[PDB]
From TrEMBL:
<feature type="binding site">
    <location>
        <position position="269"/>
    </location>
    <ligand>
        <name>Zn(2+) 2</name>
    </ligand>
</feature>
<feature type="binding site">
    <location>
        <position position="212"/>
    </location>
    <ligand>
        <name>Zn(2+) 2</name>
    </ligand>
</feature>
<feature type="binding site">
    <location>
        <position position="172"/>
    </location>
    <ligand>
        <name>Zn(2+) 1</name>
    </ligand>
</feature>
<feature type="binding site">
    <location>
        <position position="258"/>
    </location>
    <ligand>
        <name>Zn(2+) 4</name>
    </ligand>
</feature>
<protein>
    <submittedName>
        <fullName>Cellulase</fullName>
    </submittedName>
</protein>
<keyword id="KW-0479">Metal-binding</keyword>
<feature type="binding site">
    <location>
        <position position="213"/>
    </location>
    <ligand>
        <name>Zn(2+) 3</name>
    </ligand>
</feature>
<keyword id="KW-0862">Zinc</keyword>
Amino acid sequence: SMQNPSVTISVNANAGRHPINPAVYGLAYATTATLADLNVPLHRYGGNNTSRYNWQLNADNRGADWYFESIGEASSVAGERGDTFIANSQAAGAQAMITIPTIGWVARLGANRSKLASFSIAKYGAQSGNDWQWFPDAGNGVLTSGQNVTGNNPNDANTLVDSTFQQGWAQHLVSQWGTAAGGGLRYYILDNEPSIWFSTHRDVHPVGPTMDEIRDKMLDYGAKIKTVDPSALIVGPEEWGWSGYTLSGYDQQYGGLHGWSFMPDRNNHGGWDYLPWLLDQLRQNNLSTGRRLLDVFSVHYYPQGGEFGNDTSSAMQLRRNRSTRSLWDPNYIDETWINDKVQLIPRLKNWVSTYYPGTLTAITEYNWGAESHINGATTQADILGIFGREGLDMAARWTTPDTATPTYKAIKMYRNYDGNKSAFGDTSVTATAPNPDNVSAFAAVRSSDGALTVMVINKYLSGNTPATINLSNFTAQAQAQVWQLTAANTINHLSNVSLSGSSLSLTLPAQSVTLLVIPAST
Ligand SMILES: OC[C@H]1O[C@@H](O)[C@H](O)[C@@H](O)[C@@H]1O
Ligand SMILES: [Zn+2]
Ligand SMILES: [Zn+2]
Ligand SMILES: [Zn+2]
């Protein structure tokens, strides 16, 4: 009975045509089983601890996430974490992405691959937290006064390595797997969120890196890896979010300790914003040596309004319906401390085109929260539509939703909606909806099929929504197939719906993701 205002959506198979790269469907920390079942072709190995991974010991340091403990993997075979990750990805037809540390300071181990700790309680004294279950001497590096322990010796739990040390890892990967061109590892990620090393890796990097240090690191590590494999693709810098797009880690830190009135690094570099200057330095280097070191320009982005978590109150559901505007919308002011028009994807494409053309664009971490709730799933389906429409070259969600959740099934609406790996189309085309906070829509034409696939997301918290879809420039059969996800948490194959001219009409349940598969003539 309950009913929302009617909506009309116009899909025109001739407007705004461009490929959708299947790499937008990427994921982090999935399994061979879920990579195959979600039909996902990109698998990222990345995140905080990967900055500290010692490929020669097969070990890493957890940083601030786990008491700055250096911890060995079970195996002591050089590089096994990476090899295992690659085998498991390729077992499912997915391309792996491996993070190579750039930070220099990576884990070492004590006698018998025993754990080490950067903030030993016996060495630096009483602190306010410690690993009391598994390693009691490992402090959190904060004194009981709440003031950080400072002056710790970086060798307590780590060893300082350089680009020749990580080049050795690239040589190993190439020997096991072949080059990228020959079916080997295609993507090298350079580190992870380097601007905030001063916080995630305070033990070993207490001062935020300048934009110089980070440029030098991409130049250095990038050259080494490309010597070993000129066919592989380098991805970076993996910056953490809004402030990391315009301010180096040195300036972020400086600002947190001294207020925002004077940014020393920014000032030393004529008022440039960080990532645009980084892109521009890489351009100048590429123009001068003739060699491309960075191929994919990558950032992380998480909404700032409290949506990353499990708050599923009404007000938070409505905010998730709106806040994905930050990924595309030039007029949307973000409703948070950011308080500015982020329009991330156009921004990424604009920066690349202004400062380093021909570089691809990636969001290699995002998450909009509420994974186990229909609102998380409408939101995820909303995000995947936006990636394709807006022309992002790659993406990796952080991380992979549990197979029981409706969010898992949202990804599967795009990639394996019938259990036979049929997927949304791969040439984006215009679909226009009047208000995407209430209902958003995305279309594409499928190359294998000529089918027009149209995804409609009803974001409204209650009531059915009558919906009419108008096709231009597409000659369609009599009937369109219907597949649907609601809070019932199952992909349903509903009844075919009859086309009325080049229109079709239907009733959309509240908080639902609906897929129309509309085959071409004849
Ligand atoms: O917010 C979740 C994640 O984002 C980033 O800060 C890091 O890459 C991850 O290791 C972290 O846990
Ligand atoms: Zn450094
Ligand atoms: Zn400089
Ligand atoms: Zn100071």
